[PDB]
Amino acid sequence: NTKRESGRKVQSGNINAAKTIADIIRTCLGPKSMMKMLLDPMGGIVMTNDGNAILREIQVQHPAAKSMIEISRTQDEEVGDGTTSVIILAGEMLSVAEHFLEQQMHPTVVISAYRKALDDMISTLKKISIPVDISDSDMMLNIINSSITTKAISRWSSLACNIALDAVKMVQFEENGRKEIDIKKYARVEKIPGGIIEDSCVLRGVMINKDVTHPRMRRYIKNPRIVLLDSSLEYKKGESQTDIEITREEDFTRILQMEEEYIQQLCEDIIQLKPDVVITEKGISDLAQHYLMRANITAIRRVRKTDNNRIARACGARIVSRPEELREDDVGTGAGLLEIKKIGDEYFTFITDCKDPKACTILLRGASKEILSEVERNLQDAMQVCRNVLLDPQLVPGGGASEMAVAHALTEKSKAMTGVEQWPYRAVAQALEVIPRTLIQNCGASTIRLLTSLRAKHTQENCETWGVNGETGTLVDMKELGIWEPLAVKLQTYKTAVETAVLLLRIDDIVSG
Amino acid sequence: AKHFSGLEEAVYRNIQACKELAQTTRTAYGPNGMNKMVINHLEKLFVTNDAATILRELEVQHPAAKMIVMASHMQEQEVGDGTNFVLVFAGALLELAEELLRIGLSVSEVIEGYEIACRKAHEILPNLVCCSAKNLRDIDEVSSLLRTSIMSKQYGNEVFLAKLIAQACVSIFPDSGHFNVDNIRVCKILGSGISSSSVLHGMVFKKETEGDVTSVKDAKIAVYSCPFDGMITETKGTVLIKTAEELMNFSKGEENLMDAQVKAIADTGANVVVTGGKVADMALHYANKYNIMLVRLNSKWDLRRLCKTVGATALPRLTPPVLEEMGHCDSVYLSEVGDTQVVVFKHEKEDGAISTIVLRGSTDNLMDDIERAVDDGVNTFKVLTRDKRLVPGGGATEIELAKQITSYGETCPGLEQYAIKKFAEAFEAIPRALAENSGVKANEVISKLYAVHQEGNKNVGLDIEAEVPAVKDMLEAGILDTYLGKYWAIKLATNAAVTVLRVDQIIMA
Amino acid sequence: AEVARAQAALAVNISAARGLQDVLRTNLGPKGTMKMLVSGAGDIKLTKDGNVLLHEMQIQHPTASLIAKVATAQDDITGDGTTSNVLIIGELLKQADLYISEGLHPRIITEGFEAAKEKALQFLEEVKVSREMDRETLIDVARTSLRTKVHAELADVLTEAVVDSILAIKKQDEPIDLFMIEIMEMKHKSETDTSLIRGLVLDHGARHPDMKKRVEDAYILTCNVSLEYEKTEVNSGFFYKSAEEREKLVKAERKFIEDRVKKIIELKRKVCGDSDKGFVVINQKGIDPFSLDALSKEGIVALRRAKRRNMERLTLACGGVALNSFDDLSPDCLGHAGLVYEYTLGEEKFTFIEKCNNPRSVTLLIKGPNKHTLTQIKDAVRDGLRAVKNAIDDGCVVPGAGAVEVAMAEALIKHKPSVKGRAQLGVQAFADALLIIPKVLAQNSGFDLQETLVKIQAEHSESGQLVGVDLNTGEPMVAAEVGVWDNYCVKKQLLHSCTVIATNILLVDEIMR
């Protein structure tokens, strides 16, 4: 309707949410790890190192709290992790500068500061980003188990990283998009219930769990050939329209029978032609696929073009109307293996597909069905490191001095870059030093003076590579600490965070409706 | 039940149980009680000096009382008196320990003092057992034997009931030596006097009894809840109200319908056809014309009564009774039972196991009072079948144990010392439950009973000689308890109170 | 919505933790009492079992969540330590809270707990000795096991029947009993009693004079889909709908009866001779009076109402096979019970299938006239067996009754952790949390807890004499002496759930609402 709002009132409510968002997770983030509990209206506890959980589960505070879960999922998609980082970084960067600078009163000179610190981030990152080799799955393994240990898991760090190493390489887009930026669709993650890591097979390709649902279907055939419709399924999907009588019990049934009988004869047209796979993208019927499974023809049914398309190239299956009808072939082998591997009686067909676009659905195994999810998450952010290190072998040592690594270089440029912008630049110079100091405040001692000594150690000795240990609070080498921080993650979390701050800096009025 | 807390149940709910439990004995227990009006969800005045009844007549608002209420009931089960005991005695147990708390004595500690003493009691108990008397064919020995139990639970006539109540249980099984939990099903009939109450046996239907006696000697019945109102599954009883002509016509068919009915029962044979259901006119007069005995409007009770004695099953369907469904009695006959004419069956040589004492009076409370009393007599009969042991009436018996129990407590010490001597106090409340029911003080009595000093004939009963507290010889008085009943009495009361002593307060989700 | 922050977020947690925990100290050891929890059923539950009252009815708390979590497994793992698992953390917390009350990190105070539990688990591993599967050796444990679970006289009265149950094991591998638990319940004239029977017993039988009392050669026909049908393994339909239909339905039943009893009697005729050998059909529904009589004159022992679970242990005891029909059958499927007996105690007819080919089972007939009795005296059985089985299931056992308690506390030497006071403080609340076991026992009696406890240390501060609170008198004893001994599963496992949940407290630094 007719409405207007003002400035700091709308600006502080940002921080009011943004701060609380930033709060408990910074004790949860890093080696120091805490539970963010929610009391349900239902009365239940929900205990997380993740904010989005407790956030989503509860009343949404409109300006800030609605903004960050988005940029969280923005960030959660980017490298796979760092929602916690973005949401705390922004609110952090949104706090001390603003009112200070907004009592000095200006949006814009603050805005340019977001970039410069984000730029002062970039350079000294990629300056102090330590190249770690992808030629070594080791120099991936050292950094890949490093980012699977982020909070609570040193356990699945061993297995899930193993699965992630060459998978990321094996992960491909279908453009030959490389594969360093690779997504978790082309990395695809499906945890397979039951089994164990001893049962774990390394699937660097995709599992098609549609492939073998029953032993009747083709199994342990090196590479399939997927015949898509068009001839081997001739075209009648219909029915002969027999009469109906509400009196008889049988007349309701016989009409539905005549609908499936034609695909039954389409799947019969398949038997003689003898594919090993028939992909039916329109699909088949219930009694029809029995006919399919007669000839040892596995049916991939009601499946999209692209699942087949990727799998076809992945599984090395041609694309044809009919084995006696020739446009020739798509691919005979994209897959150096076809594995049909079952836990329970449902066959999960795991087909390792070399550098294929595929899904790269990578077989992961927990000690049970449930902890597979964390393994997957341990496998996800393990791919994060790989895709990071495949992207940039440069990444930064960590344990938190990376967050200082910008912070004091800012202090120098506040005195160097200057202008009146130094004041935003100096006011944003402060934001990056609370987070490690919080890890060290979780340690206590003097988390303050240590950080000043770190701030010394920053310019004195090392900005990040020789850092502070988060669970300790001593001067440490973040390389020798062995905690490695992906370079791109820094490029992501900070960037993503400054923007919602610029965002919630930009909007001083929110009308409802 | 209780979200409540704060050390409540122990210091608090336990005595309130005793509150609820007291005066339901202490003025209700003795040679007599003193009436307690009760109005159930069935709204009528119920005078109960019987522990079991008034308890169940009240509805437990405690977890506390909820436990020991059964300890008094199980006594009526196990004994037939000493139920008011559990009210007072177990009520007199824990309120002692209420001090021990403020004395600073724990629960698990002082229980032991109460725990070991029931044994010491059960060990003292055989001592003061005074002679014994058993003849299951004695009405006289059992009359005075049923006295003590009816006394506590009856303000009505003690002796003439003892003559009636020790009649039936002795009379229904003349042999006895085998006695049924229910060996007497009294036929409660209002009218005349409580003295007109008499002793008959077998089964009685006070219910409407019709047709005619064609055999007073032979009693054969198919017990039925089936209506002869036109309920039969042989043919289809179908009443047609759609037109008045239809109503008149089925009544004509009803004659031959009832000809398919009370015929079919006496086809298997029958005299009374026991009808828990209804009988319409053309059916009634037919069975009157068929000259079968129809006892009509039989309720489930007389069924449940009669269903057990003959071994036949009340059928809501009308069929010719199978061997299982046709009952026989010794004799079925119309006699005024307490001088009111109703049919009275006979089961004695039938194997008996049901006596019908007509319970009478000009009000139900007369018929209900003895109803409270007679079962105690029915009860102590089996208590007699179990032990012949006579231990004298209440209030003489307790002082002898207590004095020892006190000196036992003297030999007890360790912090349960007086916790035993507390148990020694739970004794004197029983003669006090007589003295309070009488209106004088047991301290005097206790003074006297330890003045006279001997223990087990010395007690005051409910008396007008109780103006001044005046001791009588319980064994001699014709007030005759037994070892078991006391041994039962002490047990549950010692059982239920020490475990509700072990309770904590209730946490609730 | 509402966020609880910092020490406010801490308070109600530790507040609802320790206080409700403090509610429960009437118990835990024979000097403990029963505790009354009336559930929504109006049921009177007077219990010394900690595992019990948690889930039944507990004042609403978010803290009521994790407590129900841990002590569940405590009854699951051991069966005891559950009444124990309550009183550890509050002590630990009340002591630990100080350091936080003194402004020290739940983080660092966590880390002394974890560090200290080792040397006690070590101490547990150290202070234990192998306490052999000998029943008498288990008695002393079963004596004491039920004590920490329930009242002595109840802990005692079961100890007879208890170890006998675990004595009949086949070298079964379980820490607990499954089949050794056959719960028969009778309304009794003795509140606490239990009739211990070897092997399975059937809930109800069918007695007939011609029906053989004790059948030494018993070919067991398990039976189902009863006489109301005619040679059918499927239960057919009935018409009781109309008063006329009820009449015409039940007459044919005789013939349906006649078939099966016939099929029964001639099944005896095959295998048993005519009456020459004893025989048992077990009709797990009612037995119709004809066949009740007609099988009885046959020589068959026809059993009314065995449960489907009675059915389960049935054919294993006799080593035979179950049948859902009454009908002529391969003799192998008839199970041979070296004893089939039927015992009628009061109303209930207890079939004794004895000389069980698998004595995997024994039978406990639970007694009481009263529910709460019948309720509770069953309860002690169920936990204690599980507990006591650990004494046989583990040849190793470890002293109860406080003997070991003051030892690790003395041996802990809290200054020996010198690193910060991360460990050195968290070990302090630890030796405190250790001694709550003697505390409540020394507590519940006269004196104090300490007043006796301080003896126990100073007593065992004379080292090598393992002294603890005499279970009932709240005063010193050496628990190794009498054999009063808590399971190797009791004491070893207990610290685990204790350390983790109090840590879970410390890892929750925030609870949103």
Coordinates of C-alpha atoms in Angstrom, one line a residue, chain C residues 113-435:
Chain C
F113 CA 36.5 -35.5 31.3
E114 CA 37.5 -37.4 28.2
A115 CA 41.1 -37.5 29.4
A116 CA 40.2 -38.8 32.8
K117 CA 37.8 -41.5 31.8
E118 CA 40.6 -43.4 30.2
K119 CA 42.6 -44.1 33.4
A120 CA 39.4 -45.1 35.1
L121 CA 38.4 -47.4 32.2
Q122 CA 42.1 -48.3 32.5
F123 CA 41.5 -48.6 36.3
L124 CA 38.3 -50.6 35.5
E125 CA 40.4 -52.8 33.3
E126 CA 43.0 -52.7 36.0
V127 CA 40.8 -53.2 39.1
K128 CA 38.7 -55.9 37.6
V129 CA 39.5 -59.6 37.9
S130 CA 37.9 -62.5 36.0
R131 CA 34.9 -63.5 38.0
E132 CA 34.0 -66.8 36.7
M133 CA 30.7 -68.1 35.2
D134 CA 30.2 -70.2 38.3
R135 CA 26.7 -69.7 39.5
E136 CA 27.7 -69.0 43.1
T137 CA 30.2 -66.5 41.7
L138 CA 27.4 -65.0 39.7
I139 CA 25.0 -65.2 42.7
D140 CA 27.2 -62.7 44.6
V141 CA 26.9 -60.6 41.4
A142 CA 23.2 -61.4 40.9
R143 CA 22.8 -60.6 44.6
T144 CA 24.5 -57.3 44.1
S145 CA 23.4 -56.6 40.5
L146 CA 19.7 -56.6 41.4
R147 CA 20.6 -54.5 44.4
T148 CA 21.7 -51.5 42.4
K149 CA 18.6 -52.3 40.3
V150 CA 16.1 -53.0 43.1
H151 CA 15.5 -53.8 46.7
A152 CA 17.7 -56.4 48.5
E153 CA 14.9 -58.8 49.5
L154 CA 13.7 -58.5 45.9
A155 CA 17.3 -58.5 44.7
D156 CA 17.8 -61.6 46.8
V157 CA 14.7 -63.5 46.1
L158 CA 15.3 -63.5 42.4
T159 CA 19.1 -64.2 42.7
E160 CA 18.1 -67.8 43.2
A161 CA 16.1 -68.0 40.0
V162 CA 18.2 -65.4 38.2
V163 CA 21.6 -67.2 37.6
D164 CA 19.8 -70.5 37.1
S165 CA 18.3 -68.9 34.0
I166 CA 21.8 -67.9 32.7
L167 CA 23.0 -71.3 34.0
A168 CA 20.9 -73.2 31.4
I169 CA 22.5 -71.3 28.5
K170 CA 23.9 -73.4 25.7
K171 CA 27.1 -71.3 25.6
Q172 CA 24.8 -68.6 24.3
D173 CA 26.7 -65.5 23.4
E174 CA 24.4 -62.8 24.7
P175 CA 25.2 -60.2 27.5
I176 CA 21.5 -60.6 28.4
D177 CA 18.8 -63.3 28.3
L178 CA 16.2 -63.6 25.6
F179 CA 14.7 -67.0 25.7
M180 CA 15.7 -67.6 29.3
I181 CA 13.0 -65.0 29.8
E182 CA 9.7 -66.8 29.6
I183 CA 7.3 -64.5 31.6
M184 CA 4.4 -66.3 33.2
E185 CA 2.3 -64.2 35.5
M186 CA -0.1 -65.5 38.1
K187 CA -2.2 -63.7 40.6
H188 CA -0.7 -65.2 43.7
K189 CA -1.1 -65.2 47.5
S190 CA 2.6 -64.1 47.7
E191 CA 3.3 -60.7 46.2
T192 CA 7.0 -61.4 45.5
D193 CA 7.5 -64.9 44.2
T194 CA 8.7 -66.4 40.9
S195 CA 8.4 -69.9 39.7
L196 CA 11.5 -70.7 37.7
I197 CA 10.9 -73.4 35.2
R198 CA 13.5 -74.8 32.7
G199 CA 12.7 -74.3 29.0
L200 CA 9.5 -72.9 27.5
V201 CA 6.1 -73.0 29.2
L202 CA 2.9 -72.4 27.4
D203 CA 0.6 -69.6 28.8
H204 CA -2.5 -71.8 29.1
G205 CA -3.1 -75.5 28.6
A206 CA -6.1 -77.8 28.3
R207 CA -6.5 -80.3 31.1
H208 CA -8.5 -83.5 30.6
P209 CA -8.5 -86.6 32.9
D210 CA -7.9 -89.0 30.0
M211 CA -5.3 -86.5 28.8
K212 CA -1.8 -87.6 29.9
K213 CA -0.3 -85.6 32.7
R214 CA 3.4 -85.9 32.0
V215 CA 4.3 -87.0 28.5
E216 CA 7.8 -88.3 28.3
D217 CA 7.4 -89.4 24.7
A218 CA 5.6 -86.4 23.3
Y219 CA 5.3 -86.0 19.6
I220 CA 4.4 -82.3 19.4
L221 CA 1.8 -81.3 16.9
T222 CA 1.8 -77.5 17.1
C223 CA -1.7 -76.5 16.1
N224 CA -3.6 -73.6 14.6
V225 CA -6.6 -72.8 12.5
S226 CA -8.6 -74.8 14.9
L227 CA -11.4 -77.4 15.1
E228 CA -13.9 -74.9 13.9
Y229 CA -12.6 -75.7 10.4
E230 CA -12.2 -78.8 8.3
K231 CA -8.6 -79.7 7.1
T232 CA -7.7 -76.1 6.3
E233 CA -4.5 -74.2 6.9
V234 CA -6.5 -71.0 6.3
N235 CA -9.1 -69.8 8.9
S236 CA -12.5 -69.7 7.2
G237 CA -15.4 -67.4 7.8
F238 CA -18.3 -67.4 10.2
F239 CA -21.9 -66.2 10.2
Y240 CA -23.0 -65.0 13.6
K241 CA -24.7 -62.0 12.0
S242 CA -28.3 -63.1 12.5
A243 CA -29.6 -64.9 15.6
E244 CA -30.7 -67.6 13.1
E245 CA -27.3 -67.7 11.3
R246 CA -25.6 -68.2 14.7
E247 CA -27.7 -71.3 15.2
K248 CA -27.0 -72.9 11.8
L249 CA -23.3 -72.0 11.9
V250 CA -22.2 -73.7 15.0
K251 CA -23.8 -77.1 14.3
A252 CA -21.5 -77.9 11.3
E253 CA -18.6 -77.0 13.6
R254 CA -18.8 -80.5 15.1
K255 CA -18.0 -81.9 11.6
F256 CA -15.2 -79.4 11.2
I257 CA -14.2 -80.4 14.7
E258 CA -14.7 -84.0 13.7
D259 CA -12.3 -83.8 10.8
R260 CA -9.4 -82.3 12.8
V261 CA -9.7 -84.5 15.9
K262 CA -10.0 -87.4 13.5
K263 CA -7.0 -86.1 11.5
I264 CA -5.4 -85.6 15.0
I265 CA -6.2 -89.0 16.4
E266 CA -5.0 -90.9 13.4
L267 CA -1.9 -88.8 13.4
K268 CA -1.2 -90.3 16.8
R269 CA -2.2 -93.6 15.4
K270 CA 0.6 -93.4 12.8
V271 CA 3.5 -92.2 14.9
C272 CA 2.6 -93.2 18.5
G273 CA 0.8 -96.5 17.9
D274 CA -2.7 -96.2 19.2
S275 CA -2.3 -95.0 22.7
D276 CA 1.0 -96.8 23.1
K277 CA 3.2 -93.7 23.2
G278 CA 2.3 -90.4 24.7
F279 CA 1.3 -87.7 22.3
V280 CA 0.7 -84.0 22.3
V281 CA -1.2 -81.7 20.0
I282 CA -0.8 -78.1 21.1
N283 CA -4.0 -76.3 20.0
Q284 CA -3.0 -72.7 20.2
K285 CA -6.6 -71.6 20.2
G286 CA -9.3 -73.2 22.3
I287 CA -9.9 -76.9 22.2
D288 CA -13.5 -77.8 21.4
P289 CA -15.0 -80.1 24.1
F290 CA -15.5 -83.0 21.8
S291 CA -12.0 -83.0 20.5
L292 CA -10.9 -81.9 24.0
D293 CA -12.5 -85.2 25.1
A294 CA -12.0 -87.2 21.9
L295 CA -8.2 -86.5 21.8
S296 CA -8.1 -87.3 25.5
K297 CA -9.6 -90.7 25.2
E298 CA -7.2 -91.1 22.2
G299 CA -4.1 -90.8 24.5
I300 CA -3.2 -87.5 22.8
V301 CA -2.5 -84.6 25.1
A302 CA -4.4 -81.7 23.6
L303 CA -3.2 -78.2 24.7
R304 CA -5.4 -75.2 24.6
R305 CA -4.1 -71.7 23.9
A306 CA -0.4 -71.6 23.2
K307 CA 0.9 -68.3 22.0
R308 CA 2.4 -67.7 18.6
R309 CA 5.6 -66.9 20.5
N310 CA 4.9 -70.0 22.6
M311 CA 4.6 -71.6 19.2
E312 CA 8.1 -70.2 18.4
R313 CA 9.9 -71.6 21.4
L314 CA 7.7 -74.7 21.2
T315 CA 9.1 -76.6 18.2
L316 CA 12.7 -75.7 19.3
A317 CA 12.2 -77.1 22.7
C318 CA 10.9 -80.4 21.4
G319 CA 13.2 -79.9 18.4
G320 CA 10.2 -80.4 16.0
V321 CA 8.1 -78.5 13.6
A322 CA 5.0 -76.4 14.0
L323 CA 1.8 -77.1 12.1
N324 CA -1.1 -74.7 11.5
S325 CA -3.5 -77.6 11.1
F326 CA -4.6 -80.5 13.2
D327 CA -4.1 -83.0 10.4
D328 CA -2.1 -86.1 9.5
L329 CA 1.5 -85.1 9.1
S330 CA 5.0 -86.4 8.4
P331 CA 6.2 -87.7 11.8
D332 CA 9.3 -85.6 11.6
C333 CA 7.2 -82.4 11.9
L334 CA 5.9 -83.8 15.2
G335 CA 8.3 -82.5 17.8
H336 CA 9.7 -84.9 20.4
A337 CA 9.5 -83.4 23.8
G338 CA 11.3 -85.6 26.2
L339 CA 8.8 -84.1 28.6
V340 CA 5.5 -82.5 27.8
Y341 CA 3.7 -81.8 31.1
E342 CA 0.9 -79.5 31.9
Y343 CA 0.8 -77.8 35.3
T344 CA -2.3 -76.1 36.7
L345 CA -1.5 -73.6 39.5
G346 CA -4.8 -72.0 40.4
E347 CA -6.5 -71.0 37.2
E348 CA -3.6 -71.2 34.7
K349 CA -2.6 -74.4 33.0
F350 CA 1.1 -74.3 32.5
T351 CA 2.2 -76.7 29.8
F352 CA 5.7 -77.9 30.7
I353 CA 7.6 -78.8 27.6
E354 CA 10.8 -79.9 29.3
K355 CA 14.1 -81.6 28.4
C356 CA 14.1 -78.9 25.8
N357 CA 16.2 -80.0 22.9
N358 CA 17.4 -76.4 23.0
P359 CA 17.5 -75.2 26.6
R360 CA 17.8 -71.7 25.1
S361 CA 14.8 -71.0 27.3
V362 CA 13.8 -71.2 30.9
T363 CA 10.5 -70.1 32.3
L364 CA 9.9 -67.5 35.1
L365 CA 6.4 -67.6 36.5
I366 CA 6.0 -64.1 38.0
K367 CA 3.8 -63.9 41.0
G368 CA 1.7 -61.3 42.6
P369 CA -1.8 -60.7 43.7
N370 CA -1.3 -57.0 43.0
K371 CA -0.4 -55.3 39.7
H372 CA 2.3 -53.1 41.1
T373 CA 3.8 -56.2 42.7
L374 CA 3.2 -58.3 39.5
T375 CA 4.4 -55.2 37.6
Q376 CA 7.5 -54.5 39.7
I377 CA 8.7 -57.9 40.7
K378 CA 8.7 -58.6 37.0
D379 CA 10.8 -55.4 36.4
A380 CA 13.7 -56.5 38.7
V381 CA 13.8 -59.8 36.8
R382 CA 14.1 -58.1 33.4
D383 CA 16.9 -55.7 34.1
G384 CA 18.9 -57.9 36.5
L385 CA 19.0 -60.9 34.2
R386 CA 20.4 -58.7 31.5
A387 CA 22.8 -57.3 34.1
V388 CA 23.5 -60.6 35.9
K389 CA 24.0 -62.4 32.5
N390 CA 27.0 -60.1 32.1
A391 CA 28.5 -61.9 35.1
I392 CA 28.3 -65.2 33.2
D393 CA 28.5 -63.6 29.7
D394 CA 31.8 -61.9 30.9
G395 CA 34.2 -64.1 32.8
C396 CA 35.7 -60.8 33.8
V397 CA 33.6 -58.9 36.3
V398 CA 34.6 -55.9 38.5
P399 CA 33.9 -55.1 42.2
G400 CA 30.7 -53.2 43.1
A401 CA 29.8 -51.6 46.4
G402 CA 32.2 -48.8 46.1
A403 CA 35.4 -50.8 46.6
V404 CA 37.0 -49.6 43.3
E405 CA 35.4 -46.2 43.4
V406 CA 37.8 -44.2 45.7
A407 CA 40.7 -45.9 44.1
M408 CA 40.9 -44.4 40.6
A409 CA 40.0 -41.1 42.4
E410 CA 43.1 -41.5 44.6
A411 CA 45.1 -42.7 41.6
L412 CA 43.9 -39.9 39.3
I413 CA 46.5 -37.4 40.6
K414 CA 44.8 -34.5 38.8
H415 CA 48.0 -32.4 38.8
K416 CA 49.6 -35.1 36.7
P417 CA 47.6 -33.6 33.9
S418 CA 49.7 -30.4 33.7
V419 CA 48.9 -29.3 30.1
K420 CA 46.5 -26.5 31.0
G421 CA 43.7 -27.4 33.2
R422 CA 41.8 -28.3 30.1
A423 CA 42.5 -31.8 31.4
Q424 CA 43.6 -30.9 35.0
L425 CA 40.2 -29.3 35.8
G426 CA 38.1 -31.8 33.9
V427 CA 39.8 -34.6 35.8
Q428 CA 38.7 -32.9 39.0
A429 CA 35.0 -33.2 38.4
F430 CA 35.8 -36.7 37.2
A431 CA 37.1 -38.2 40.5
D432 CA 34.1 -36.4 41.9
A433 CA 31.7 -38.0 39.4
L434 CA 33.4 -41.4 40.2
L435 CA 32.5 -41.3 43.9

